[PDB]
Amino acid sequence: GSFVEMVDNLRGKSGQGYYVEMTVGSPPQTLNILVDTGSSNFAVGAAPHPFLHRYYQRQLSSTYRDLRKGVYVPYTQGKWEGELGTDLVSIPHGPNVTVRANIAAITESDKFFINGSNWEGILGLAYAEIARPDDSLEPFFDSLVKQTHVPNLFSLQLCGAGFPLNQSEVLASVGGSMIIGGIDHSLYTGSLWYTPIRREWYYEVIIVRVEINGQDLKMDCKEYNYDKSIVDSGTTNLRLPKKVFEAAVKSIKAASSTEKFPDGFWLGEQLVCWQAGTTPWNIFPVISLYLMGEVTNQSFRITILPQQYLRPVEDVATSQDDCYKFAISQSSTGTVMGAVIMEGFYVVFDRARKRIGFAVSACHVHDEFRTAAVEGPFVTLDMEDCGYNIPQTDESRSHHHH
Ligand SMILES: CN1C(=O)[C@]2(CC(C)(C)Oc3ccc(-c4cccc(Cl)c4)cc32)N=C1N
Ligand code: NI
Ligand code: NI
């Protein structure tokens, strides 16, 4: 219940992801790698790029093997692509093991790397189903478990920033822990509650109820999971399906109505500020997501504060003020529980038992009046099915799974 060596092994800049130090090759080449529960490839910069100080040099590794197959991964704003291979991989502030893993050597990319983020690659921690080019490319965590005696579980404590801030010219530093193979009891307090992983592709879960400041949104619960709900350390915001987003914003606007913010604020495109230390936290409501319990007809709730959904961004021009970005945003691809959710909680990705645990994080930002909370059970007699079934395309139906 104590993993001192892996506590505080995450770093990053606010809004630019949390990364862990990894080594690749023989002798070990250190890179900073974004921890991403929303994808399933281990992919690292492997050629010069303007935003990289360093990259994986395959020619310098005696243990590198080329798989003689390329990989191309487009997404909304751009792409990464490169060459598949295997090499020896370790996590210096992780388990004392070295594994041979698939590595996608990124040779070309567009709007992938971010100036100043300080990471050079991505560690996709989700399941094989969503790996590229296909599900036969074994993800890193699968290789780790198979090759070692590391328990099939990892846990994440993402610790977000708060005012006062150290620097005006750079983004706020963030920290956290990725405990590989276990649960560290110093990272949480109170009860640890589990929700089932609905299906092993993304870390998919089911939300059964949503409340804003104690008030039920009263929507068909399938709307909350349209077309999926996932836990994603590779997303900054809490992202909500259109209908849910609009309902949530209406409620948050109403509660906070003493303050008249520009439309740009609610779109996440503009900061709002108060004089240092005077932020009226109490005018902003708590948000509770009720997640399906392990027991039929049970749920538990995770509750977050405005300290989680209003992200601190220090303004060079107004460094005397505390300024915030609204970090709840609209989705067309379902609910995404990103850093806005995860920074409230210690989150246990219990792959062995097909479940995700939540407990109050020992590092969450709060005040003297309210705390992020994990509470249950809530019993609902004859609880409905809140899961959505994504329409099956012919292309996906046509795949064989041998
Ligand atoms: C949603 N999501 C992505 O778009 C993605 C997809 C992938 C192809 C792995 O590329 C990236 C790259 C950077 C970030 C990023 C960039 C800045 C901050 C953060 Cl948290 C992540 C997120 C992703 N992984 C995700 N989970
Ligand atoms: Ni080191
Ligand atoms: Ni076949």
Swiss-Prot record:
Expression tissues: Expressed at high levels in the brain and pancreas. In the brain, expression is highest in the substantia nigra, locus coruleus and medulla oblongata.
Residues recorded as bearing N6-acetyllysine in the entry: K69, K218, K222, K228, K242, K243, K250
Gene Ontology BP term (one): response to lead ion
PTM note: N-Glycosylated. Addition of a bisecting N-acetylglucosamine by MGAT3 blocks lysosomal targeting, further degradation and is required for maintaining stability under stress conditions.
Top-level taxon of origin: Eukaryota
Induction / repression: Up-regulated by the Ca(2+)-regulated transcription factor NFATC4.
SS bonds (residue pairs): C159-C363, C221-C386, C273-C323
Molecular function terms from GO: amyloid-beta binding; aspartic-type endopeptidase activity; beta-aspartyl-peptidase activity; endopeptidase activity; enzyme binding; peptidase activity; protein serine/threonine kinase binding
Topology versus the membrane: Single-pass type I membrane protein
GO CC term, one of those recorded: multivesicular body
Function: Responsible for the proteolytic processing of the amyloid precursor protein (APP). Cleaves at the N-terminus of the A-beta peptide sequence, between residues 671 and 672 of APP, leads to the generation and extracellular release of beta-cleaved soluble APP, and a corresponding cell-associated C-terminal fragment which is later released by gamma-secretase. Cleaves CHL1.
Family under the similarity heading: Belongs to the peptidase A1 family.
Protein name: Beta-secretase 1
Provenance organism: Homo sapiens (Human)
Chain's gene name: BACE1
Full-sequence portion shown in this chain: 58 to 453 of 501
